[PDB]
Symmetry: D2
Subunit: 444 residues, 4 copies
């Protein structure tokens, strides 16, 4: 061990560690979940990018000296490129409003930067975690800026998955365009529709979230960096470094506690979860059986069965999706509570908030990808079973009204229900023309 | 048109002459018009408040020399409210701020003015019966209100218990009716092994039986009250009087500084209502699923029709009672979240949000009792089994091959039946 | 006296005078759950009457509905649109049937009022038939979800006005307190100085954002499935003229059939406003705490009386009422989420619960913000001296001395000030 | 790698893996969260105990040959003892209602049993994951039994944490018995109490939870294991786990009941509610040091800035609040899973058990950390506490018998306007202080 010192006193730190005393304290202070900052690596990379922006802004503004600027920029590039992730060890449930994550960055960046200067660990007389790495910065504009960037960095995985699942539902809508089946309202047999229309409707509801997701995420572009001249500078560098176009917030006093964008964005994750769960529930119900459920579609069998129980297909991929959806809805309540609990000039609970949102983005992204790839793409229609449902439709009797009158049609409907026959069968047996029914049964 | 002029610490105001409420209730009416839902929409809380006032008046008469003429006028007024009169005078919004103060004050003024009337004196004659000095003697909001909240919940228990027992009985009787009705069990919505529809309905009963005892045990936490914590002889006596008036044995909290902010019992009780709603909604869901069809769904049961259907669409029975049950359960779950937030938001020596809490829990209690009542009476009691459709499900079971094991080769009969579309009774002859 | 009426289930007696019929009476018995009737959400009743007017006009214009019956029906619709006959809308908001009983409650009331217009008695359904005439060309699954969306559209102005009123109130105080120096607090610890005016402008700013978002999300409700073709296209055009909103037919009926996305998104914007509002109210309760042993930075107008012996005690009742409304709206949002998630195939059966929760939450929030603005924010006063003292006792001020005397020296001045009660300017002046 | 086969086909498995083909399919089917079964080791140990119980009953009933029993039992013992955790790889968000957890155990146990027999992995004709390890078992009795057992095995850690925090608050209630301060109701100065009473109230509310937690956890003791064999398996499982279990009476009810998970999650929620409130109070009482309430000092556990002395961010209570919001969110996740049961099974117990075990761990550590790193070291600002009590306007009431109500109120208003105490005003008008200092006496 090497021995380090901060304002509280002395501790012994593994020489193998790139983190320093303040991080070690945080590890014992907030050991709560065995979930560390490295399990949310987007926040780590965002933290390294903000630090680079700030070193550059200090350098160009003559504030920070030139050998320091350059060793620290190197160090940040190292992390941005995915090195030293295991050095990010503070619990996601950390108190301190982001301070412990800021410090974990500052200290790791300092040590790494020393190691670029051929100097040993803890040599903070050369590169200081606070004095240098943190120069012109405080946690209350750094951490909120890095949270927003982490979410901006994470948008693409969600968008890609959503588009992929939309495409999968679209393809099946085209494949099943000719597959007639019975619509069901309140789970009672309704009027004929196509299975293709049902799948196209899964696509269409989700298509509505793509643009909305993008537009709410754009709210995160408005950042408070340099909120304590230097500010305008750091923001410019952060835009180039991150590859995302950022802008200074119009109101700093408003921004200091504002969690509004976090609430809106979580609310769209929630909205996608609600739709996705309903769709998964439909898939489980449509594939019920194989003999005594609806038996309208077959899902790909992705888990092995028993030779003596063939035809049993547990709809495990939709089940996993349902679970992710319930989790996302609970995590949204978690975010609501943290957001509601802000006080005066700060919300202290952004670490909780960013952990729940990034987690929910991961969960939903993966669930949609799995749902498309390991289920939707391989769904097959039981064409004959779908047709049987539509042809047994009591609603077919309504197409007889023009020709025979309401009362007689209703009497033909009653006779069909009683005798187990199709409306067409009952119409035929009466010496009637059932041509209008044929039209109700035409997907085209 | 006539008014009388009243005064409080904020100033003077004109009050409609015949109103039994006074200046402070009038201010609360102006201040908290938020939902159009007034205190008289939760009459249990109004009755409970009147019980508390009566208990306090009796203790003041016994121990603190409240004059007999005031005492008897005041008690007569509380009795009237307890018995359902003057409910329309309880006009403050259930969303009122003030942690219950405006509810206390609505009671104080109405009781004062109704007492005055019993003494043949005019409204507003507060030198004779004073809302604060007489009706509120020895009390403050901070012991009167939480005590009245606890009492209101206790007085409302029996309506939920009765309904739960009614629904349980309904389910038990169909479990007997359906004991010989064989059908296919379904797991993860896949055809599984045969069960009876009787067993299915008895399981709906069984899960609800677990709730009756838990409900009484949690409700009994409400018996510990902080009444008289404002003013120990007075306290002890007011509680003895309140137990007598209410017919429920109550006790003093042993720790008043703890009792001051404590909402634990509310959260636990809201929690059991929530648990009951989760089970009931699942059961409603099952009923809607089992009655799907009549041709292209499950079609295993038929629910009684309670609203007319279309003559051209015979057989269609929308499961409207279970649907109304689902909506009530989603309301209760949401209300439980409202309670959780109010509860978590207490500060130091008070939770300011008990008006919201008591409003939500009483509402949820009424909603649940009536949903369970309606489910039993307007749905469960008339449920029919489509016995031959149930049978065909069970006889179509591939699980039946497993029985054949004394003949592996059984797996080949199962494979043949699946693809052939025939039963495992049909394939095994051959 | 009662009149006798009949439907497909049988006969019932109806109060002679009632404008509702047998179908509505059945619904009263079937769904008696909450004691909250359709008349408690009058925007839905008005919207139903608009949809019934538009359908009658379409039907008339296409030769399906005779002139005298059309004209009497439209006049009956107009009466209800004005608020007449609200008391005849008696069906519980927790009704099952996905909106059927609401549709029928309208059909029967409009039939009987049109019959009155033609000088006929109640129940003369031979002249005007609730189903055949008033519900001509219509079904629940198009009429009700259309009327839900329209009710939501007609209810926008109230929330928008409330929100603008509140923003205006905070903006005014932001200017008035523009020079009131005070101490910022982060994590509840003394931070760096700010102005009280900035604190209030920020409340305005955060709520300004919600205004455009509210309008944007509300536009989504214009896509309706009414009439799901000569009839369909005519009905929407008539409904757009009647309602003064430009409505568009949905392009995907199979998708529209179960879609609740817009309800969830709307409820979500109410939830966000509530989150923000509650935080603001909590801020107001904290800043006005005391008056001597709290923060004491501002005084809320006293709106509810106190005891003259306890002066300076101002319970923050308006913000408290606001917190309660916010907690309710968040719970109601969970209720909407559960209902939206529980859609099945070609219908969501739970729109009656969704529309009730969203309309209630809108009314509560609108009233909460109007009250917060008028009865609290407008009268707020700064304690200028107590504010300045907090800013004067800020240890953070020592940071401005770093360039003057260097770190170590500035930090010992900081340290000396802490350990000695005195301010940074006091210790530096020595 | 080695090649295995199941009823769907063949996969190659890394040669050093103890899991088999069915687990490998599960990793592919349900990669969603990057959180594997090994992050909830109590369920791993429960499953191993259930498998040990089943092998032993099977053996004693002469259905499982001696050498297979001995090897299986040895393998289960290794897992109960904490070996092979890393082989439990299936995502917590797995579909299949538990199947993949059951199969993960069956495969790992079979292979480890093979190692005890000196046989290679994959030799399933010697020890078969399904025919031998899963003999007389199905997912739908084994999984929900293991879930109930996991929650029972995790009770002690939460009870220990709760008792620790109660004891920390009790000791401070004793320490602060003579510290008078001003009560606050609706955030307004009310009447004096003691700081000691305030801390004893924190203890007292949490004490009500200890007994109820146990009585609710007792509900998990009723298991559906086996539903002769069944009774015997439960007797064994009780012995193996050291927790007394009993067979459920109704198997058709038990098949879908999630009643106990909802009640238990509700007690975790109730605890979170009380704990967050308490943490809110600690953060408020320690606000300042100068322009807050400044009544107590929390231990400084996070390094400060030398030029901001006096700033003590309440980081431990803040981490507690975050945990409490997570627990409330998780509780909603459980409610949705529980409500979404259908017919003879609830498909979502994997999600339920994960949320509940995570919530148990979070709360247990939060409460431990609050006691040890915060409450034990809290100190009173005795003088500031006393000043708050002495400036209480309520004091004017004690003068009513001396000067009458009216004159008492004039002094109250004057105190308020001058900023003086009621005693200072009283003395200034030549009135006796006697009555006042009685209402400021900690003995009441
Ligand atoms: Cl991440
Ligand atoms: Cl009530
Ligand atoms: Cl309305
Ligand atoms: Cl665990």
């Amino acid at each position: 061990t090497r021995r380090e010192q901060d304002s509280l006193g002395e501790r012994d730190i593994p020489m193998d560690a790139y983190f320093g005393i303040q991080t070690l304290r945080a590890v014992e202070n907030f050991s709560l979940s065995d979930v560390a900052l490295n399990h949310i690596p987007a926040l780590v990379r965002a933290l390294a990018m903000v630090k680079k922006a700030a070193a550059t802004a200090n350098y160009k503004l003559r504030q920070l000296p030139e050998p320091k600027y350059a060793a620290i920029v190197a160090a940040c590039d190292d992390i941005i490129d995915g090195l030293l992730m295991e050095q990010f060890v503070v619990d996601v449930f950390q108190g301190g409003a982001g301070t412990s994550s800021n410090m974990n960055a500052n200290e790791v960046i300092a040590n790494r930067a020393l190691e670029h200067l051929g100097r040993p660990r803890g040599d903070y007389q050369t590169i200081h975690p606070n004095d240098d790495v943190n120069m012109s910065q405080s946690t209350n504009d750094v951490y909120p800026t890095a949270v927003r960037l982490a979410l901006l960095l994470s948008q693409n995985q969600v968008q890609t998955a959503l588009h992929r699942l939309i495409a999968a539902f679209e393809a099946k809508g085209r494949e099943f365009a000719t597959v007639i089946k019975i619509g069901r309202t309140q789970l009672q047999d309704a009027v004929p529709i196509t299975l293709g229309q049902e799948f196209e409707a899964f696509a269409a509801t989700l298509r509505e979230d793509t643009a909305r997701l993008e537009e709410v995420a754009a709210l995160f572009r408005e950042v408070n960096l340099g909120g304590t001249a230097y500010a305008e500078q750091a923001i410019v560098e952060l835009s180039q470094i991150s590859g995302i176009e950022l802008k200074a917030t119009g109101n700093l006093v408003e921004a200091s506690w504002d969690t509004g964008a976090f609430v809106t964005f979580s609310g769209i994750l929630r909205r996608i979860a609600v739709k996705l769960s309903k769709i998964a529930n439909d898939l489980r119900l449509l594939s019920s059986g194989p003999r005594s459920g609806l038996g309208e579609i077959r899902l790909p069998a992705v888990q092995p069965g028993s030779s003596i129980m063939p035809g049993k297909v547990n709809p495990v991929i939709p089940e996993s999706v349902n679970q992710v959806c319930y989790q996302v809805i609970g995590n949204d309540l978690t975010v609501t509570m943290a957001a509601e609990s802000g006080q005066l000039q700060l919300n202290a609970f952004e670490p909780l908030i960013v952990y729940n949102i990034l987690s929910s983005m991961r969960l939903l992204g993966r669930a949609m990808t799995n749902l498309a790839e390991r289920c939707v793409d391989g769904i097959e229609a039981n064409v004959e079973r779908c047709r049987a449902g539509a042809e047994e439709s009591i609603s077919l009797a309504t197409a007889l009204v023009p020709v025979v009158g309401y009362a007689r049609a209703a009497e033909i409907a009653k006779q069909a229900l009683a005798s187990g026959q199709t409306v067409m069968e009952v119409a035929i047996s009466k010496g009637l023309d059932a041509s209008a029914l044929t039209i109700m049964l035409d997907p085209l």
